[model samples]
Every structure is written in structure tokens, then in C-alpha cells.
Target: NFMLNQPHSVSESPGKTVTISCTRSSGNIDSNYVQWYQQRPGSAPITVIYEDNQRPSGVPDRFAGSIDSSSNSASLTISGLKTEDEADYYCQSYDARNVVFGGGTRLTVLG
Candidate 1:
């Protein structure tokens, strides 16, 4: 067993698309559901994608999630990227009810 790993940061321009990947150190990623969350500087993390790829109500369609068995990882892809979407994102999962998380990725919106 190991922790989820992610890129330290990502940068993208407005209206572009970006994908942040979370790699599991061990085991098949599809064996359990993966969730993604966004964390702002002054607030708690909020769920963006859950149960692998389910977006919560009120969350925009531009945000999506996917799992890749080939790489043993999960991904959160954002399209139509906006400045407001700039935040730290973390991928989460569990093993036998024990929660696991990635280091978190800081998404910056470029000019």
C-alpha cells in the first residue's frame, strides 16, 4: 500500500484544457472509487468529482474525472478553464475504509 501521488503544480490559460493525474503507488486504481476535490486558500476542500467521475449538482460540466487502469491512476480533467477554477486539487481514495490522498496540485491560470 502507498499514497496517491500528483504533480506539484499545473498551469493553463483561460479557455484551455488541463488534466491532473493522481497515481497510486500500489494496487489497481479501479479496485476502489476515486474522488477529486478543490481547495481554496481560505476555505475547506470541496468535492468536484466523486465515485470516480460523478460531478455534484451545481458543479460545472467543464470539470470531469476518469480512471486509467493502464497506468494505475486517476485523473481530473478540466475544460474551458477559467481563472476562478484556479485552486489546489487533491485526489482521494480509500483502502478498507482508510482514506488516502494525493499531495495536491496547485492549478494556476496563466494570462
Candidate 2:
């Protein structure tokens, strides 16, 4: 079994930037690619970053993802934050046997 650990929440003001991290407890964090999903309250999650760092069509460039070998973690960074960016973000990765999800991080874009 593996674990993806994440913070409970992060907050930033509009026009600022915020990064949420997902750390792997076991295995090489780079063994498999990571994906980031955004979900507003009561809404289904949608992929914002996938295949490690590629953003899906229609997603703003402000959203980015990357892996830090030193930390054994993946990060989802949102620049030029806006109120609409407030949402719960989750990181997902798959191993040979299972899918691992980080405890979601709630983003609060302070008005």
C-alpha cells in the first residue's frame, strides 16, 4: 500500500499564488505520473493537470503541476489566483496495483 499526504487547506488573496503539495509516503513519486483535479463544493471533480504537468484543453495556464524529487512530492500551483479558483484540489496517482489519492486540499481565495 502507498499513501499520498496533503495539507488540509491553503489560502491566498486574489492575484496571488498558492501551491498545494501531495507527498508520497512510499515508492518513488516519479514512478507514475500525477494528476490534479479541481472540485467545487457539490460538484464533480475535473482534471486540471494530468500526465504530470500538462493542462487539459480549456484549462487556464495559471494552473500548473510538477514533481519535486527532493521532497518525493507533487505540487499543484495556481498563479493569478481568483475567487473562482476556490475549490478542493486532489492529487491522484496509480501504481502497478492501486490508485492513490491525497487527502484533498481546500483552497480559499480570499476576497
Q: Pick the candidate with the highest lDDT.
A: 1
**Candidate with the greatest TM-score versus the true structure:** 1
Error of 2 at 47 (Å): 0.1
Query: Which residue runs of candidate 1 sit more than 4 Å off their true CA positions?
Result: none
C-alpha RMSD values across all candidates: 0.7, 0.8
Clashing pairs in 1: none
* Candidate models: Cα lDDT each: 0.95, 0.94
| lDDT, model 2, position 6 | 98
Worst 10 residues of 2 by lDDT: 94-103
Model 2 residue 92 lDDT score: 95
- Could you tell me every candidate's TM-score relative to the true structure? 0.97, 0.97
**Per-structure clash totals for the candidates:** 0, 0
lDDT of 1 by residue, 1-104 (tens): 56899999999999999999999998899989999999999979899999999999999999999999999999999999999999999999998799998999
